[PDB]
Amino acid sequence: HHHGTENLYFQGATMAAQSLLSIPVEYRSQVWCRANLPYPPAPQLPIPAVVDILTKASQALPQISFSWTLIDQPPDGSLFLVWQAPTLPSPPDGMHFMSNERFFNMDVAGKVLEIHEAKHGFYPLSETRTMHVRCRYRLLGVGFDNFWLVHYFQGSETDSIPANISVAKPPHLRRYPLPDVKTSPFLLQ
Template identity: 35%
Template sequence: MSVSSQHEGLCLRYPEPLGPQANVSYEAAVSMLMRAIQLAQHTPFVWGYIDKPQEGHIYLIFMTQQLPFPPDGIRYQDQEQKIIMPAGPGRELEVMEVKFGFVPNSSDTTAWRVRRRYRMHKGGHPQLVLIHYGRGQPMPIMPNLNQPVRNYPLRPINEPALFVMGEKIGQKVYPNQHSGPAERPGPPGMGMSFGGIGNQQAMLAQQNNNLEALERRSQRDRSGSMNARAPPPARIEDDDSADESDMMSTRTLALTRYKRNHELMNEVFMYAAFSRKKEFPPPKSPYSVFDIANVEARVAKMTAEIDELRSKAEARREARSNADGAVGDDPGDVSMEVSGTTEEVPT
């Protein structure tokens, strides 16, 4: 595939036609994206364009991180807005919406087109993108923007279909190969159609029935194809093939290698860690680092020193007490001299 074709909007699309729908609820988008993961395991995506889609058209594409979102032939007069909302336990849905679109130099007299992109931000496959084209509030067309957004005529497509997920990831399917539902259109009512406009529960039930029927048909086609021809070559375990590296993003390849290496390492270290229980000796007493005899000798020495200090202190107190008693027994001179004469102090 040439670089110019990529820039012109050539993208990998789900081969089955998706039924038109006026509106797509968030619950329906999540259900479609989760079922698309199962279908993409066994259905190759085809190269194609999204060009001037009509109101209600729905597309399922596989986007790589190396390429921008493909142009669709519509000019938009608004900036695309992004929101992320919870979609159940461990899941988050990303919604990208842009309004006020019109097809330049066409019958569009106002900018009324709305495009919404849905993908699983968490809990699904982030490279599967569901696109819905609807109708919104009209706005006058700006004359300076009434120019085509891509070059016409579009280049013809000669690229084979490609498996984007599953065991056959990266394998190409050429037109002369018979490989299930990707080589021929499905009968009416098959595929991932939403059904008619009506009760939401009825639409989801019809959608699930259609998807299950498509899965059963894919399994029958794969079984018949395997019986009709020789078995396919063994799966190549090396993730570094040229086709896969060209078509898959670096993040996807790194995640695949990480999971594979983690499984191999887990087989080795799980047995080494949990094959048998190790018997550990009971923990030592915290006092085991001390020598009892040494401690007792130090205690005896300190006790003797304390007794000696107490004896000295008692002797000092006794000596001080004796000294104070000797001083108290001397009556001293109690006479007083008055005007040079000695007079006895009366008692």
């Protein structure tokens, strides 16, 4: 009646469900399911690098843990491996955008790579011009459909445009300060 779509994804994911239930209800919509790696930071990745990173993560999955955690204003270079349903909205990350996220599809070795590219990213508390890009990648048909590489990096000078939260997406500033909510680790395979 509120959770039918989420429930589909937690049929098999019991540990992940148990961990989310340990979080106060008001923060359950706010957390990412993020791998405990962490990835070394990187500039914008070549497409074959993206495909290799997701492929290696799919092969290593039984030895990689995840925590529910808040992501906020990550520095340029930040790369995360996340578990997320493609039919649910991305949780907040403190970034706002002056343009709509664009969805591209590439064929790589007979597989679909999704590229969700959000240019014109800004941090409204500290930026009056856009300075960032967020990309969300996933690789389909390799048994890793609901896992994503999320990458934050510096925008080009030419793409920088005036920023104003009043017309940005998402439309609401998140509430600060953030609570400490990071769960103990769990497995997803």
